């Protein structure tokens, strides 16, 4: 029977919380690059926004590798659904910082893919946020998103 403890669902409590934190020291950090800000040149951000990349990619797994995260498709209709969209909202957050800091080296190679791999860049963002957030709150989490 798959299925979460109280002990693992404040774990992902946990762990979503954390890459959050990590979206929003990547802004900032986006933000002081370009903007053009005495301590932030090009060194400055990437040993920044790459271990802040690595460390989301982190509590990625530690989210997409809880057991029944990994056996979703058995386990209860509210979490495969979960995953599916966690996955999909993890991965986009992800590659959209990785994207950017790309962009501020001369690397278009992510930008490419990205509106390939997003049509419709907004119109993805909230229905993942609101679809995971639904998710959440059907998975009884109160964890209320960005």
Same mark, same amino acid.
């Given at each position: 029977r798959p299925k979460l403890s109280t002990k693992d669902l404040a774990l992902i409590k946990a762990d979503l919380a954390e890459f959050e934190a990590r979206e929003l020291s990547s802004e900032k950090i986006l933000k002081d690059t370009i903007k053009e800000? &005495?301590? &932030?040149?090009l060194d400055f951000a990437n040993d920044n926004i790459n271990q802040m990349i690595g460390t989301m990619k982190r509590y990625q797994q530690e989210i997409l590798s809880i057991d029944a995260i990994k056996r979703s498709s058995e386990a209860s209709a509210d979490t495969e659904a979960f995953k599916k969209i966690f996955k999909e909202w993890s991965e986009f957050k992800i590659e959209r910082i990785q994207v950017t800091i790309d962009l501020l080296n001369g690397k278009k190679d992510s930008e490419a893919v990205f509106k390939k791999t997003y049509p419709n860049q907004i119109i993805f963002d909230d229905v993942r946020t609101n679809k995971l957030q639904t998710a959440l709150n059907n998975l009884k989490v109160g964890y209320e998103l960005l």
């Open positions: 800000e &005495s301590w &932030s040149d």
